[PDB]
Amino acid sequence: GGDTIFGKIIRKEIPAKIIFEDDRCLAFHDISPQAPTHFLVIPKKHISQISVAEDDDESLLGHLMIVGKKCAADLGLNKGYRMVVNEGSDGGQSVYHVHLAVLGGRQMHWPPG
Amino acid sequence: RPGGDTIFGKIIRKEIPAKIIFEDDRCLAFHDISPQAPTHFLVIPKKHISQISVAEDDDESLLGHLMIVGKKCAADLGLNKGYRMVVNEGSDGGQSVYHVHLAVLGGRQMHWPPG
Numbered sequence: 001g002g003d004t005i006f007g008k009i010i011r012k013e014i015p016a017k018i019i020f021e022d023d024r025c026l027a028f029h030d031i032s033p034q035a036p037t038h039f040l041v042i043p044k045k046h047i048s049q050i051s052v053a054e055d056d057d058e059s060l061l062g063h064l065m066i067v068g069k070k071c072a073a074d075l076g077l078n079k080g081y082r083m084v085v086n087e088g089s090d091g092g093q094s095v096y097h098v099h100l101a102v103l104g105g106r107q108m109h110w111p112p113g
Numbered sequence: 114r115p116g117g118d119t120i121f122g123k124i125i126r127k128e129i130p131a132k133i134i135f136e137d138d139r140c141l142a143f144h145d146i147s148p149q150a151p152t153h154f155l156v157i158p159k160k161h162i163s164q165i166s167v168a169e170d171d172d173e174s175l176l177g178h179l180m181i182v183g184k185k186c187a188a189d190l191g192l193n194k195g196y197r198m199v200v201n202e203g204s205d206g207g208q209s210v211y212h213v214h215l216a217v218l219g220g221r222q223m224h225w226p227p228g
């Protein structure tokens with residue numbers, strides 16, 4: 001899905017530790033984990049950033065969050081977690097393919113960066 | 114009651130004040146009273162859902178709508194350099210109000226890790 005490293009991961013051209021897959025998204029552990037559990041849920045559709053998501057994408061974006069919730073439960077995050085979507089330079093977005101990050105296994109702090 | 118028992122339900126029913134950015138039949142966006150960035154607002158469903166870990170499969174479109182409204186509000190507020198969206202779940206997530214909400218923070222460089 002697209003011209004980024006996340007596209008390569010979706011196409012199985014480079015490895016990742018995959019947690020879950022369906023016909024429209026992929027969940028996998030982040031290569032630079034910031035918490036004992038840290039994974040990403042990404043759409044297979046190449047949406048470059050949340051700021052350009054269209055109205056028709058509403059269901060899909062919600063699906064990323066539901067899949068994120070389910071994977072977090074499966075990975076034993078019973079004390080909680082934080083979901084994060086980064087947009088643009090101020091948001092610290094590292095790849096221009098929409099991704100929902102899920103972090104847990106430790107106390108998350110405030111402010112969130 | 115429509116909106117639930119938390120302070121966010123009271124905000125939905127206009128029983129306590131808020132600085133509202135956007136409102137429709139499914140959600141409400143309003144500024145945070147303890148901002149952690151120069152712009153910091155919340156997008157919440159009008160349907161009470163306590164936390165994302167108990168959201169139902171059928172809540173998918175609603176959850177996505179929070180994100181679309183979040184990004185539209187960010188644009189309308191001039192966050193052209195970007196922003197961070199956050200959902201806190203439970204104790205480790207730092208959740209304090211058990212009515213699910215998407216926080217949007219911007220107007221400064223956000224750092225990594227995100228807490």
Ligand SMILES: Nc1ncnc2c1ncn2[C@@H]1O[C@H](COP(=O)(O)O)[C@@H](O)[C@H]1O
Pocket residue numbers: 120131144145146147148155201207208209210211214
């Ligand atoms: N009356 C209020 N109006 C606006 N924001 C509030 C109010 N009470 C609490 N908050 C914010 O709601 C957020 C709760 O999110 P969390 O702590 O992640 O559950 C915090 O950022 C609070 O500052």
